[PDB]
Design a protein around this ligand. Structure first.
Ligand SMILES: O=[N+]([O-])c1ccc(O[C@H]2O[C@H](CO)[C@@H](O)[C@H](O)[C@H]2O)cc1
Ligand SMILES: O=[N+]([O-])c1ccc(O[C@H]2O[C@H](CO)[C@@H](O)[C@H](O)[C@H]2O)cc1
Ligand SMILES: O=[N+]([O-])c1ccc(O[C@H]2O[C@H](CO)[C@@H](O)[C@H](O)[C@H]2O)cc1
Ligand SMILES: O=[N+]([O-])c1ccc(O[C@H]2O[C@H](CO)[C@@H](O)[C@H](O)[C@H]2O)cc1
Ligand SMILES: [Ca+2]
Ligand SMILES: [Ca+2]
Ligand SMILES: [Ca+2]
Ligand SMILES: [Ca+2]
Ligand SMILES: [Mn+2]
Ligand SMILES: [Mn+2]
Ligand SMILES: [Mn+2]
Ligand SMILES: [Mn+2]
Lengths: 237, 237, 237, 237
């Protein structure tokens, strides 16, 4: 099994699995059934930005999603990641379409991991930032239908020349280098991530959503995880 | 007097005003009667470190103090600075003594403050990092008995030529340029400071402590803010 | 008088004082008479980016001005800045108009000074970055006609409500906190600034220029510096 | 074979292959016979720090080695890396011993690279810093005798239980994720590296040196590259 911690930008409400009756953002801890969600006003065609922050001091994961001139959705969950994650992990973005479809384009992405110790002045860290992706983005592990290059953007799910988004698609893109998310001697551990997304659909309701996840190094897309499972979890439990 | 928000490293328990019967950590908002406290196994003679963090997402101010190969004190508090501070401020370090003394020596200090806008790539930030203080540190506003140069350190309170601390002393150090702590359009607003220190004393009980405060641009040690008032508040009311 | 070092984005050619027969970029080591220049193909109305860098290992000052969809004009000179500037200085922007005029709008400004001492890795550093300029910017010393808050940009020179520039104008913008540009116990000294400008002129003869400058803490607009002197020098010597 | 561009801290004078009569810092381009060098007052048994720097503006590679309060060696060379290195590479350290020995301890390492493209306000960048090497450092490709964890340091070559160094050893350490060292659209490409070391030989005649190299993704220790070849080049041709 895989250990998954993630913030989901869910566009399609699957009321049957406890989804709110509207698009939303939520914190997923080892399950597709969000521990805490927040109403989100999905804007079709408009480029949204999403900022996620976390630190072991207050032990609280938070996510803010905003569109220029428009409001912002926020959500926070009290979680001690050191109990719910391997010491080493791999960070990345996931997205998927199902019966309904949408474009899950990632215009940019940046991440910052920071491990401060008890020993004065000793600190380990990692940070990367992409403002444009290359066809051969040699530092991202592409998985599924994820492809880089087109217009310098990262397409997490299948699209066509018409610009049309294909249904039943699923893709993931995660940074090559393993992230050292925590440790015992660390007095303060905290990570921060930011990405800009572009989502638009031709049909009545877009689906299914983009998500930022943290997982163990060898994580591979679970069998039949398109649609409601956002390409992250193997079952809707 | 004016507005002050601070995290205090209180080494001497002043019961009459609210100090618990032990050296502690605490969040101070517009008053010297802490909103939150946490025991702190003060290590006399040792070099300690402190980390202060805040962000408008979850909206909590928290601090952590540690010593190499030892425990770590922690304290957080819910506070929306938007309702407690002027949009523009100055940040600094304070210290003091009275009947009993101690050395409030700061070995290094750093600070970072960012303002993430609602519009993509609109981020305003400021960050300085003092790892070595000089005889004429032109970018700091030294107040009270604060001096620079001694071993490249920053002495907040008076120290005798041989090194011995001196009672009834009050000093301060404010970075020169004003900091734009918050803004109404900012989607995310945060800051974080860090400093290593040395609190050494001869007598049975060191006093009074060290503190990181944030106040309005124009600010100086309030009349009579010696000892238990840490040089931050004009009174204990 | 004031000790100045500047990178000049010269739009109007003042052949009479050494200006090449075409708009250009040049390095000024204490005189308006550039120590070296390179042809700059201006792009009236296009937002461009300026990149300036320097380190004490090479003693070479370098600048690069580029536009989207076009080649860039690079320029570099060997100048031991510690043998020209004080240990502490002030960084800022300057712009002026003469008979003919233009808009010297600054969209964003960023700067970073890193002074790495000789001790292990005890580094000192300052970094500010603006991507949005507020109406009352308590951290910027405005001089001359320089205004802010206009579209969240910085207006170095004069402009009328209808976005029409004015002539015989001069304005400067200086960062508040002094900058310790050089130490003598540091193994490596380095700095860099980047700004994005928007120059639009109606009279088919844009004048006069923009310039990044480093000066003495108390620097100020010289008299009659408007026009060909870019509000930086008192004469064309 | 592999394409190597390295900065060598050559402790042993192999006159037979161009090494000066004294220890030195040299710049190696697709060869072990340095293009340029400089005398190095190697201080047997004391922590030192090397600092590499390079940028595309003035296309120059420089290095500075220094021990606390002592001689500061320096060496530079003009080289357009984009015409020598693959658009994608890997970075890492390397050290070795032969008939003579020495401890090749790295106590910390940091790297940072940025790519400012023609695209206004859009950058790409990678930065990592290690102040402590974990027993199981999952983001480094240890080759040869390279081992981390011991004393929280990183041992590039063989070191006996009693601490004594061993002869005829070679080790490497390359960061896991590939580094997009350059790209056409980039108006300004530039990296920076910084690392502290502790070379000590229990006598007076040490050898053979350490080196910071940039190589093609799949570089492996050449056969017989011990000692004078520093585990970087297949032949001292
Ligand atoms: O509107 N409907 O009646 C309706 C249509 C489809 C539906 O589920 C299907 O499509 C979703 C959207 O792609 C997926 O999340 C889900 O995995 C898949 O089973 C549920 C209800
Ligand atoms: O021993 N005692 O009982 C005793 C000693 C001192 C005392 O207060 C005095 O010294 C403190 C420590 O310097 C200050 O915080 C305080 O402002 C000042 O009034 C109170 C009681
Ligand atoms: O027609 N002309 O040949 C002619 C006209 C004006 C002129 O100078 C005046 O206007 C310039 C552009 O605003 C300034 O650079 C200069 O400082 C100012 O004195 C020079 C030549
Ligand atoms: O006795 N000596 O002084 C003496 C010692 C060693 C020597 O060369 C040998 O050892 C070097 C140092 O390990 C290697 O770099 C070199 O590859 C190998 O041939 C030459 C003379
Ligand atoms: Ca759903
Ligand atoms: Ca007290
Ligand atoms: Ca001119
Ligand atoms: Ca040699
Ligand atoms: Mn959901
Ligand atoms: Mn107290
Ligand atoms: Mn000129
Ligand atoms: Mn050599």
């Amino acid at each position: 099994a895989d250990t998954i911690v993630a913030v989901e930008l869910d566009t399609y409400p699957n009321t049957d699995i406890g989804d709110p009756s509207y698009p939303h953002i939520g914190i997923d801890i080892k399950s597709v059934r969000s521990k805490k969600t927040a109403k989100w006003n999905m804007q079709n065609g408009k480029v949204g930005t999403a900022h996620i922050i976390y630190n072991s001091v207050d032990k609280r994961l938070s996510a803010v999603v905003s569109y220029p001139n428009a409001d912002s959705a926020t959500v926070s969950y009290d979680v001690d990641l050191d109990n719910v994650l391997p010491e080493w992990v791999r960070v990345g973005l996931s997205a998927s379409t199902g019966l309904y479809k949408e474009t899950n384009t990632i215009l940019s992405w940046s991440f910052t991991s920071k491990l401060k110790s008890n020993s004065t002045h000793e600190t380990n860290a990692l940070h990367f930032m992409f403002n444009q992706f290359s066809k051969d983005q040699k530092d991202l592990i592409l998985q599924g239908d994820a492809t880089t290059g087109t217009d310098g953007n990262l397409e997490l799910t299948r699209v066509s020349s018409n610009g049309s988004p294909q249904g039943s698609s699923v893709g993931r893109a995660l940074f090559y280098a393993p992230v050292h998310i925590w440790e015992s001697s660390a007095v303060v551990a905290s990570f921060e991530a930011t990405f800009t997304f572009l989502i638009k659909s031709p049909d009545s309701h877009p689906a299914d959503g983009i998500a930022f996840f943290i997982s163990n190094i060898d994580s591979s897309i679970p069998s039949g995880s398109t649609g409601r499972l956002l390409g992250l979890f193997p079952d809707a439990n």
